[PDB]
Symmetry: C4
Subunit: 333 residues, 4 copies
């Protein structure tokens, strides 16, 4: 595999159509899904030359731990859909690559089993109709050694996924929500979680500047600037188009991550040049899992690590902080 | 049906080519027809998160009545072209959905019959060579219980519809103008109508800012920002591209509606975020009528209602007024 | 024929390939040829409503004569390439439509014969290596009753026409330059022509603002804002993209015409809304000549007249001057 | 051959696929490769008319020598891949056209042999792990009569060339680096070269404004504004998009060249109108070499010279300095 697109092709060959569509699809007309790619494609980096590259490092410190790359595996529900080892395959590969892995509330293997793999596990939270269930998930995660709570704030309910409707998609009987209904979360919910844990709370799905500022005021440790991979509001702006404005507005008050469409180390570099602390990567990790299980994910992470190092150095950046000081230019197509 | 595009496909299957072309077509090269879609596709919404969605409502008050959605059925002439029940099928479905229905001066069933269906009927007026005929239509409408007069101001004469010319299109003998020649309307005409009725007068086909302001000064109750679905001036700006400027200029002096290309609840949300009080929907209603008669229109209205509620909530809006306070970003393709 | 594109199709059917390519082609990669169309397609008009249209007139006064439309036939060399009656067919049709016809220095029928047709003939001048020949052409034109001298200033030499090179195109023996070598013209040349005639001198091929201003200072009666239909510098800006700036800079000091890509009455309206006094139309006139001779050109002029009247009225304009006060908006694709 | 694209077609016919891919390809997704063309295609020139063109000259003075055109042959490694005479064929053709030829550190014929051809040879330098080897190359070049040192500053290491990876590309045994490992160069390296030679040092691969300014401060004689033909950082801005800003910032302190995508004399004119002193041309020179050896390169240089003269004169420019005073407009597609 020499690009992440080689893994998409390999996953499409192996997965059943309806599962590939569950993975690939977005809501509505898929405008926001396509826009995540378009938005990245229009950003160009202005690289710097002639800097010292004797010790290029792709490491960052985030939520109190060193990560090997400015990247984490996004929360993706029901990974046993893609490979029989599901979440444990991905978590093992992430651990070995030094990348944080986000354990999902809708994981097909229990959060305690995945946490036992080791590494840098984070935990993603959905707010539930029964509040106490959500707060119990948080305590379970913390007790199991998760290092951050990624509170998904863009899913008062699931978006209209027309591929899934047309396919009549349903989980196979062999895939379940192993940690066991959505309720709209509010700012009250955020405070309840903040009060119930000592871990950093990261709000995932922020796009408005004022919501970023309010997240900082609310005591978030981070936000993920995200339109949920185009799966929630069809017509929501891509996160990459809001990122620079949001970075400026929080002015170092919390970590600012971005997701949606990251498909190369060069895309990681674009995101950092626009001000991101780190990115999440979703679909490509699942492509690698589907294609080749744990080894597939390992190969994908190795490929991304190589592409990030290559892009950084070609742009004159010996560290991620230097990459954040790069300038960009918007171009056409 | 899971999208409005499923209904287009179904209507194209059933209607004779020349009638489908009468419905689908625009004037000239169809540049303004295509632009209505392009203009919407470039608008992205910046959604808000973590708001109270306990009682999301899609209702509005307009022209003194509560409507179930910020939407009305646009005036479309000669609906018996599409289904034998024509206007009565559409009006019944609109009534049952709680959506206003605009009765046309060129209706293929008389305005009194359609008004007798009930619901929230509005009446669309063409100015005629014989003025007294136009003013008699207005009094007929008012006597029949219509609630607003939608004065079409963009049709001094009909545009050049090349599909209709190439097809040699003419009304079948079984379709007539049941209420029974265009004369250019002027501001004088508007005043004559304003003087002859107690109903709100809504000017449909406004695109210039100064004409919006003048409409308010003239005592209009509303305007529809519209290029007549690309059927009048070929090269006229889409209404969606003028809407925000117009909303700012009238500064709450009348209701500001928009039409042209609305094809989903997400498009309704875009229009409201740009400042619209409500939208009109034309072609899709006729697709649903052609495909499945009254039941078809009912299914379309149910689908739109679901998509509007979904988009609003995903964008953090418990009411249409909140949706009007959303911000937008122009994007590419 | 219901659009000008119907005539292109008809001309392509009848003309030999190499002659169609002589007509259609541009220089180089044809970027400027394509851009003339792109530039018009991105301009949208903001129409006005509810104005008095009792006496819509498409007439203008230009160079001391009334013209039936804000349009003239562009200078196109060697019209016998397209039809055996060549220039006389086109000039007769123009005369009968009330449109000025530009007689070319490279006409395939002598300028005195074409002038004898009557109508509103203008004369286009190429500066020649032998100056006296050019000044003798001017006196011949004036003696024959031409009403303006259209001095082409963008042809120090002919551009690189790759279609013609690839085809090995040469004039048939039956087509000659009937008035009988290019020399670069300068501002000195313009003055020599201004001194030798009482007719208005119109500089055709101006694109820079400062050259427009200098044209006024030099005593020009008009300019044509033009990239020579994409046939001269490949990469020259379209005239339509410079027009508004140029109109502002001359501030009524001379007539400002535009050409390049005008293919409908709506395009004429766009040009006038951007400030043009009138347009020239080239290729379409030759399509009509090739398809059907004099009658073809007559039908094209009738179609354009209808489309101009239609566009004007739909935009609320009872006169060309009102059309020049319309505003425009740049849109996408 | 009537355009440079005729030579691409001819080279593709003759070269083995993997060698054509070595030549054509870029790094990563090839976004920067495509963008070099897109960026040029959106620039339009505003030509001037009616200037004296009695003695149009395409000559420039650069690095103390007169060049016949504002163009040099870019450094391209391993030219024996394309034709058995390799670099000597190209250098001979360049010499005879009066164009500088850049001898590469990775030349497949020794730099002394190519310099012995005569003409205006420049020498391109890669910094090596062994510094002394790089400084010895510089002295060799100077001793052999090269006139400038073109220090490539964008290759701390080679970019990820996916075509070459997929093809398993390797040099044939019959092609070697005849002058005989990359080390990242720094500003220290530049100073070491500046101290070791009396020749002008030209930094190739500058894109950031501040790096241009620093190059002047460092005593560079020139820079080449360049993304290495899209072969280095995938997502690097095209040089043509930075050129005007860079020209303004150095404010005549060094020569500012540009490369990437120059495919015609009109493109040369665009580059000069944006402020370039001269351009480099890479791929097209190799197409001509592959197609027809020395004679091919001669024909390409003759074609470019004709197109540059044609574009200049059509734009009203009797000299390159006048071309640099042309204005431009950004257009669409
Ligand atoms: C199949 C699938 C399932 C997902 N499940 C969740 C989830 O349970 N929780 C969540 O916060 N995001 C979920 N996401 C969104 C991702 O975390 C992420 O925002 C999105 O995939 C990023 O874009 P990318 O896939 O383009 O890299 C899911 C995404 C996909 C494709
Ligand atoms: C077949 C057809 C007939 C129409 N007849 C009328 C009419 O009689 N009066 C009027 O004001 N608008 C008429 N319109 C314009 C619509 O009211 C509306 O402005 C346009 O259809 C909105 O765009 P949409 O179809 O893209 O939703 C007609 C539109 C169509 C497609
Ligand atoms: C075949 C052909 C021949 C032309 N000959 C001349 C000419 O002799 N003199 C001149 O000033 N322009 C000449 N032109 C340019 C036209 O006057 C005009 O600028 C151009 O055709 C306008 O664009 P249009 O063809 O897109 O309408 C010629 C154009 C064409 C297509
Ligand atoms: C096959 C190939 C090999 C190259 N080798 C070198 C090199 O050895 N040194 C260098 O500075 N640039 C090298 N370049 C980059 C060119 O000098 C130049 O920047 C690029 O080709 C310009 O773009 P163009 O090919 O679009 O004209 C190479 C380019 C190509 C296509």
């Amino acid at each position: 595999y020499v690009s992440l697109a080689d893994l998409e092709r390999a996953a499409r060959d192996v997965l059943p159509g309806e599962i590939f569509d569950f993975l690939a699809g977005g809501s509505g007309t898929e405008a926001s899904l396509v826009a995540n790619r378009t938005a990245l494609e229009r950003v160009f980096v202005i690289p710097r030359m002639l800097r010292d590259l004797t010790d290029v490092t792709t490491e960052i410190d985030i939520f109190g731990r060193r990560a090997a790359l400015p990247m984490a595996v996004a929360p993706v529900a029901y990974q046993r859909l893609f490979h029989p080892e599901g979440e444990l395959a991905v978590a093992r590969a992430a651990r070995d690559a030094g990348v944080p892995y986000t354990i999902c509330t809708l994981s097909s293997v229990s959060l305690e089993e995945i946490a036992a793999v080791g590494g840098r596990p984070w935990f993603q939270l959905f707010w539930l109709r029964d509040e106490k269930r959500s707060l119990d998930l948080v305590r379970r995660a913390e007790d199991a050694g998760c290092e951050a709570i990624v509170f998904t704030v863009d899913v008062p309910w699931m978006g209209r996924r027309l591929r899934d409707m047309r396919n009549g998609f349903a989980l196979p009987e062999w895939v379940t929500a192993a940690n066991f209904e959505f309720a709209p979360a509010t700012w009250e919910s955020v405070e309840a979680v903040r009060a119930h844990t000592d871990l950093p709370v990261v709000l995932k799905g922020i796009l408005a500047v004022e919501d970023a500022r309010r997240a900082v005021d609310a005591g978030a440790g981070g936000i993920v600037v995200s339109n949920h991979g185009g799966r929630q509001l069809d017509g929501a702006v891509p996160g990459i188009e809001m990122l620079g404005e949001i970075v400026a507005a929080v002015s170092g008050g919390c970590e600012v991550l971005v997701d949606g469409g990251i498909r190369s180390g060069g895309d990681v570099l674009k995101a950092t040049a626009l001000g991101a602390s780190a990115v999440l990567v979703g679909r490509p990790v699942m492509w690698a899992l589907a294609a080749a299980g744990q080894d597939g994910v390992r190969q994908l992470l190795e490929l991304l690590a190589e592409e990030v190092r290559d892009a950084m150095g070609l742009a004159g950046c010996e560290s991620v902080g230097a990459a954040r000081r790069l300038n960009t230019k918007l171009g056409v197509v």
